[PDB]
Design an enzyme around this catalytic site. Structure first.
Site, PDB file in Angstrom:
ATOM      1  N   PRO A 112       0.831  -1.207   0.000  1.00 47.46           N
ATOM      2  CG  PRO A 112      -0.013  -1.079   2.142  1.00 47.46           C
ATOM      3  CD  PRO A 112       0.551  -2.054   1.170  1.00 47.46           C
ATOM      4  N   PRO A 113       0.344   2.379  -0.508  1.00 44.23           N
ATOM      5  CG  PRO A 113      -1.070   4.029  -1.301  1.00 44.23           C
ATOM      6  CD  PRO A 113      -0.909   2.547  -1.267  1.00 44.23           C
ATOM      7  N   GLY A 114       2.656   4.616   1.013  1.00 45.77           N
ATOM      8  CA  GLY A 114       3.043   5.184   2.280  1.00 45.77           C
ATOM      9  C   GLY A 114       3.299   4.193   3.387  1.00 45.77           C
ATOM     10  CB  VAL A 115       3.528   0.583   3.592  1.00 46.98           C
ATOM     11  CG1 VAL A 115       4.432   0.081   2.502  1.00 46.98           C
ATOM     12  CG2 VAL A 115       3.306  -0.447   4.696  1.00 46.98           C
ATOM     13  N   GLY A 116       6.316   2.635   3.799  1.00 42.39           N
ATOM     14  CA  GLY A 116       7.687   2.790   4.246  1.00 42.39           C
ATOM     15  C   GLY A 116       8.744   2.821   3.168  1.00 42.39           C
ATOM     16  CE  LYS A 117       5.779  -0.354  -0.995  1.00 45.04           C
ATOM     17  NZ  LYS A 117       4.648   0.598  -0.851  1.00 45.04           N
ATOM     18  CB  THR A 118      10.459   6.226  -0.845  1.00 44.91           C
ATOM     19  OG1 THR A 118       9.288   6.761  -0.224  1.00 44.91           O
ATOM     20  CG2 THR A 118      10.144   5.803  -2.260  1.00 44.91           C
ATOM     21  CB  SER A 434     -13.395 -13.658   5.409  1.00 44.65           C
ATOM     22  OG  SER A 434     -13.349 -14.196   6.717  1.00 44.65           O
ATOM     23  CE  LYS A 477      -9.804 -12.052   8.287  1.00 47.87           C
ATOM     24  NZ  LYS A 477     -10.638 -12.778   7.294  1.00 47.87           N
TER      25      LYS A 477
HETATM   26  N1  LIG Z   1       8.558   1.500   9.979  1.00 43.55           N
HETATM   27  C1  LIG Z   1       8.634   2.831   9.898  1.00 43.55           C
HETATM   28  N2  LIG Z   1       9.315   3.505  10.860  1.00 43.55           N
HETATM   29  C2  LIG Z   1       9.371   4.840  10.798  1.00 43.55           C
HETATM   30  N3  LIG Z   1       8.805   5.655   9.903  1.00 43.55           N
HETATM   31  C3  LIG Z   1       8.117   4.964   8.980  1.00 43.55           C
HETATM   32  C4  LIG Z   1       7.983   3.587   8.907  1.00 43.55           C
HETATM   33  N4  LIG Z   1       7.196   3.230   7.826  1.00 43.55           N
HETATM   34  C5  LIG Z   1       6.883   4.378   7.277  1.00 43.55           C
HETATM   35  N5  LIG Z   1       7.410   5.466   7.919  1.00 43.55           N
HETATM   36  C6  LIG Z   1       7.254   6.862   7.540  1.00 43.55           C
HETATM   37  O1  LIG Z   1       6.136   6.963   6.680  1.00 43.55           O
HETATM   38  C7  LIG Z   1       6.533   7.440   5.378  1.00 43.55           C
HETATM   39  C8  LIG Z   1       5.802   6.659   4.316  1.00 43.55           C
HETATM   40  O2  LIG Z   1       6.711   5.855   3.547  1.00 43.55           O
HETATM   41  P1  LIG Z   1       6.976   6.056   2.001  1.00 43.55           P
HETATM   42  O3  LIG Z   1       8.429   6.285   1.881  1.00 43.55           O
HETATM   43  O4  LIG Z   1       6.123   7.188   1.428  1.00 43.55           O
HETATM   44  O5  LIG Z   1       6.531   4.712   1.275  1.00 43.55           O
HETATM   45  P2  LIG Z   1       5.862   4.760  -0.137  1.00 43.55           P
HETATM   46  O6  LIG Z   1       5.035   6.063  -0.286  1.00 43.55           O
HETATM   47  O7  LIG Z   1       4.924   3.611  -0.308  1.00 43.55           O
HETATM   48  N6  LIG Z   1       7.000   4.754  -1.364  1.00 43.55           N
HETATM   49  P3  LIG Z   1       6.410   5.762  -2.586  1.00 43.55           P
HETATM   50  O8  LIG Z   1       4.993   5.381  -2.864  1.00 43.55           O
HETATM   51  O9  LIG Z   1       7.236   5.642  -3.928  1.00 43.55           O
HETATM   52  O10 LIG Z   1       6.452   7.251  -2.072  1.00 43.55           O
HETATM   53  C9  LIG Z   1       8.050   7.311   5.328  1.00 43.55           C
HETATM   54  O11 LIG Z   1       8.595   8.367   4.547  1.00 43.55           O
HETATM   55  C10 LIG Z   1       8.464   7.428   6.793  1.00 43.55           C
HETATM   56  O12 LIG Z   1       8.685   8.787   7.121  1.00 43.55           O
END
Ligand SMILES: Nc1ncnc2c1ncn2[C@@H]1O[C@H](COP(=O)(O)OP(=O)(O)NP(=O)(O)O)[C@@H](O)[C@H]1O
Ligand SMILES: Nc1ncnc2c1ncn2[C@@H]1O[C@H](COP(=O)(O)OP(=O)(O)NP(=O)(O)O)[C@@H](O)[C@H]1O
Ligand SMILES: Nc1ncnc2c1ncn2[C@@H]1O[C@H](COP(=O)(O)OP(=O)(O)NP(=O)(O)O)[C@@H](O)[C@H]1O
EC number: 3.4.21.53
Lengths: 528, 248, 149, 81, 48, 49, 149, 100, 50
Positions: A112-118, A434, A477
């Site tokens: 999902p968007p914003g989960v951590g991956k950048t 489910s 769940k």
């Molecule tokens: N496990 C974590 N610990 C600390 N901060 C986190 C964690 N996961 C997410 N964040 C914060 O939440 C933000 C969301 O992650 P993000 O880098 O936007 O992933 P993403 O949006 O799916 N990659 P993209 O879609 O290309 O922008 C990060 O920039 C961190 O600041």
């Protein structure tokens, strides 16, 4: 400076297919006119081979246990991605080149968007002590952003992988690609061919970008490719790349992610470094009631809104913001509730059922409600879902036409009673169609007239015999049942393996009845 | 005219890697024939590095009452976004003197068309007393209209966001990005994917374009994004943005 | 397949770098779930029960081979016969062919006389394999109908 | 039933099959539009009090609200014979 | 839009252009006009 | 055979053979569009009924 | 008159050992082995058809196979031929039909070299996954071998 | 009197000798043959011809089949003139009428 | 090299509106150098035409 560049050929460690080409075009260089644009692109090329890293590598870290703690002070909820990256430490620590060729340091995060991956690339690089470049392929349309351009073109600079090598300085670095699934394409070059040329084990040893026409090494460099969906990846790059399907963050890591990592950064950003506190109950309230996507981005933006409304209170009057923010003063900070919780009110409702399924936005409870009215012989499911609940509904009622003497039903109830089923919209079938046993006790609560108590949570599906089907996504769940304060969850007995994924602080409250038969569901649940 | 450009770099106050990159390109531009097309593309390259700002910032006035009275002298009754602007100033009054990574946020304005959420950025510019350049993103098909082309493409520009960096000239503007819901999303064209680099509040300072092609510091830009509906924004891009949902 | 073999060899390597005892390490099927996390799919194995009124069908799809179950319960109703599944109705037509076989052979297995109208039938299809590849498991439904009736 | 409803009572809500009144969204213009015509008695769901506190003072002081959990509480008011 | 026809930003004409003096007149059926545009330019209801 | 009908239909697969099958189990009385029909074969079934 | 046989098409899912059978057949006739990737869209208009008056990299990827293998009768592992056709301007051309047919296999004019190359006795193995998006002037006359899972 | 005659349409089940029927007219006529098979080409502007601004612009498949003959009269075959997919992006029916 | 193509013009480039395009392409042929990357399309143009 021509002889200084000639010394800097052999000073670097710059390899043997490039060396005679560099010396021969430098041999071309000293006799021709240095003011030429051909001389300009020659001096640019023989700045570029002697600035790009070839063999001058940063030291790989000799131990795992000081990198895991740097990961533990940067990200929390990605334990499996942490295991995949210390897994890569376990590969590169043990081998160190013992006749080994056929490497694959090529890793992907999809979720999902914003989960951590950048923000992994500011944590993996701090962990294993390698220098970092954040390469962007958001709106890269042409192939030539990565492929580069030839030196016959006036104005030529190389591809963005090689520009990343310009910024990072050292060879064996780490890369985070910014976007893959919405890397767009046009004519005169698809950039999926350029990322084919980057991301193959066949051509990581040689690269041959079309500015530096010699081979280049992309072997030791570790890759992060970041995307949101798997559907719009170009299928070769989906194929020959290791994908981690990141699951969505749910509340029992979101309570930790606030107080550890996300809240202290933004109250440092607001200014109340030690001059604000939040209860854990308000964090839990914000996640069950104010946020409804799987990422923590509007967790970040509305606890940011808590911090900046606290800054608005702290600057319009000098009074102390070191009051703790609990559940009921939080509505002054954040206004209206955008979403509403799920009430497991423990008085026995007559025709209800405590439903559980999962959204892609986290594990969310349901409430499947049903009435029986003496009409005709037809059914109607009216809860904005498809036929995959309808076949479970016919499975449930054709179970309940058997064992008619057991549950006190009249002799002809199928042709006499109309039965209607409501489901909430949170049940999303891609892995989770489910809550079939909730449908079965909704039929059983409607027809018998005996109520269903709300002390017992439920998850399953229905076979017509009276047995259940298994389910996936059991973690979200069970912790969603742990959210509502309800501690008795029905599972299929063949879902006993999923308790190992749950640690003991959630598992000590959840009284899990591993139940394989629908008659055992109706005997355990249904209040007379 | 290269002997002005060195102290233009020195009093521009550039960061160190982009400063060494611009000085290395100036050492390239010292030696060549000035009549070449390489001379005009490197001269446009060094010119675009000089007239983009690096440390030049207008002073943010910390007066809550002046910002509130200018917000009330341009708009009436938009209580959520007016409280949002005065609490953004309450952040920037409090962090003045504390060296933190001051990312100015990414505001989304949804609702029906005609609320004034779609031309609020003139009043936001008057309320900060900071300079203004509204950036045309109405139905854009071109991703390199946002992030630019490289200089090997011959008459290239770094995109309209860096053209707002030109015509504003300070490192903290307000950008009225119009019609973010109206960007076309397709495999042949998707500039919303180009909005994902320049609207991420942890990595806007590592925004690389394609013509300056350096990490540009976009923490201090006060981005304004507008939309007439929720759902036609792509699912990454609506997640990035503070949705000030103001209704009809 | 070899992606998951890659992940189990590196998961063996992770406890090798903290416990270096492995001069030999055998992995059977029981400690396989310690690696790879959650079971992604489930093996539809033998159900290990000799006698209850349903049988085991077969199918073939490019996901692979599987051990389908077809079940039916003969509830005492209006005599309707309906399918319960998201596949084709030729499975219900093979069920109808099985119904004509049990109507042609209503004597030798102890059936009642009016079994066609005194029993409502719903027939389960729990699955997703064979859209048109091998889309017929008719004697499985024939055992399901005869053991239900 | 052949029975009319009350003339000064306008209403809004959400129905589930048992008869529990689920709450609604975006109520401020709905309450002031009911205030705009000649209605000063409105039916709301029970858990829209959190949305109703965001609605300003003159809207709450002009009309009358009724927080309702079950639709039998609606139909005990609005069936004149 | 007269708040930004004075600052209309064309893709080729990079500097924002002044169009607020220009009398734009447009033609058409309401339903296949988009919702911001039919709310945005003044309708002259000309029937048969 | 009590339900089968030996039929002939022209295909782009040349000459083909048919086993037109009908059981008519007791129920609600609607015609069931089974066996992957065209746009005309339900009209032929309506003419039959 | 039929000096060269019609050419294969290994069809199946992506992931099967088509490279393993290519190495087996090159080991079978005692032959040095080359693999041709053709992984992405692989525009033959852009990358094969240079006409020598660019800088002139990759003079035809068959000839790039030939200089790597060093022998006049290799086993060419042509791969991913279903990924050839693009939705772009000049990029679908299907220009390997001139390479593969025996009526101009003995002569071979190259896009770069413009000299008739002796591509006689050259064995070919073409491996491509999905049968539908093959260029039909290949599969009108090429053989096909089903590799299932 | 009139230089243009109508043009043949062979239609039936796939594989009833229609390419070899064009080859047998080619052998009876003592005149050259080519077969192109359409459906893969999704553009009118591939076949009718893109402009020369595109850097790798090869021309259309029907004049590729006409230039592979190299003679001003071929016994030309248009295989798979009906089996075209749903992606009618640049609509080739106008160009395939305009070459016809 | 550029006269074998003109031999192909006055042996098989016979019609005048067809050959007028090839004649001003021949005018364009001596305008740029035949090693430039644009000139591939120009040489391929009259080779495919002739
Ligand atoms: N496990 C974590 N610990 C600390 N901060 C986190 C964690 N996961 C997410 N964040 C914060 O939440 C933000 C969301 O992650 P993000 O880098 O936007 O992933 P993403 O949006 O799916 N990659 P993209 O879609 O290309 O922008 C990060 O920039 C961190 O600041
Ligand atoms: N509170 C207010 N006070 C004064 N005038 C207002 C107010 N709200 C709206 N307006 C006026 O109504 C207009 C509505 O804005 P609008 O013209 O829709 O923006 P826009 O031109 O659509 N921007 P965009 O579509 O994103 O390019 C404003 O520009 C003002 O002229
Ligand atoms: N009517 C026929 N009589 C004799 N031989 C035939 C006949 N039709 C086909 N053939 C044989 O089949 C060959 C033709 O190949 P075939 O498999 O029919 O493909 P095709 O019809 O020519 N092309 P296509 O229809 O597009 O698949 C001929 O060379 C003959 O050997």
């Amino acid at each position: 400076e021509i002889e200084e560049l000639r010394e800097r050929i052999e000073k670097k460690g710059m390899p043997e297919p490039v060396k005679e080409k560099a010396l021969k075009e430098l041999k071309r260089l000293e006799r021709m006119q240095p003011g030429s644009p051909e001389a300009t692109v020659s001096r640019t090329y023989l700045d570029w081979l002697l600035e790009v890293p070839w063999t001058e590598a940063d030291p790989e870290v000799l131990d795992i246990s000081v990198t895991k703690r740097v990961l533990d002070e940067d990200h929390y909820g990605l334990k499996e991605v942490k295991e995949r990256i210390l897994e890569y430490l376990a590969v590169r620590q043990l081998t160190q080149g013992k006749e080994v060729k056929g490497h694959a340091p090529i890793l992907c995060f999809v979720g999902p968007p914003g989960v951590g991956k950048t923000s992994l690339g500011k944590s993996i690089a701090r962990s294993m002590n390698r220098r970092f470049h954040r390469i962007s392929l958001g709106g890269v349309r042409d192939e030539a952003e990565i492929r580069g351009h030839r030196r016959t073109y006036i104005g030529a600079l190389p591809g963005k992988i090689i520009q990343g090598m310009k910024q990072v300085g050292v060879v064996n670095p780490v890369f985070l690609l910014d976007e893959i699934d919405k890397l767009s394409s046009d004519w005169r070059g698809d950039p999926a061919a350029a990322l084919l040329e980057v991301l193959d084990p066949e051509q990581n040893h040689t690269f041959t970008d079309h500015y530096l026409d010699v081979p280049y090494d992309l072997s030791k460099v570790f890759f992060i490719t970041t995307a949101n969906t798997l559907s719009t990846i170009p299928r070769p790059l989906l194929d020959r790349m290791e994908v981690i399907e990141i699951p969505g963050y749910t509340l029992h890591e979101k309570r930790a992610i606030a107080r550890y990592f996300r809240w202290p950064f933004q109250v440092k950003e607001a200014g109340l470094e030690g001059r604000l506190e939040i209860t854990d109950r308000a964090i839990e309230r914000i996640v069950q009631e104010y946020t409804r996507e799987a990422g923590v981005r509007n967790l970040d933006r509305e606890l940011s809104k808590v911090a900046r409304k606290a800054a608005k209170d702290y600057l319009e009057k000098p009074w102390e913001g070191v009051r703790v923010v609990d559940a009921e003063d939080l509505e002054a900070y954040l206004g209206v509730p955008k979403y509403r919780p799920d009430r497991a009110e423990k008085e026995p409702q007559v025709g209800a059922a405590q439903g559980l399924a999962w959204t892609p936005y986290g594990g969310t409870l349901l409430t499947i409600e049903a009435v029986a009215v003496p009409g005709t012989g037809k059914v109607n499911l009216t809860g904005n879902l498809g036929e995959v609940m309808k076949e479970s509904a016919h499975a449930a009622l054709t179970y309940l036409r058997a064992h008619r003497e057991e549950w006190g039903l009249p002799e002809g109830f199928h042709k006499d009673y109309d039965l209607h089923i409501h489901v909430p919209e949170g049940a999303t079938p891609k892995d989770g169609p489910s809550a079939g046993i909730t449908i079965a006790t909704a039929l059983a609560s409607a027809l018998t007239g005996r109520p269903v108590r709300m002390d017992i949570a439920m998850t399953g599906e229905i076979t017509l015999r009276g047995r259940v089907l298994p389910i996936g996504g059991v973690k979200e769940k069970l912790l969603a049942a742990h959210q509502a304060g309800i501690h008795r969850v029905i599972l299929p007995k063949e879902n006993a393996a999923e308790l190992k994924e749950v640690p003991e602080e959630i598992l000590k409250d959840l009284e899990i009845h591993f139940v394989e038969e629908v008659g055992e569901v109706l005997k355990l649940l249904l209040l007379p």
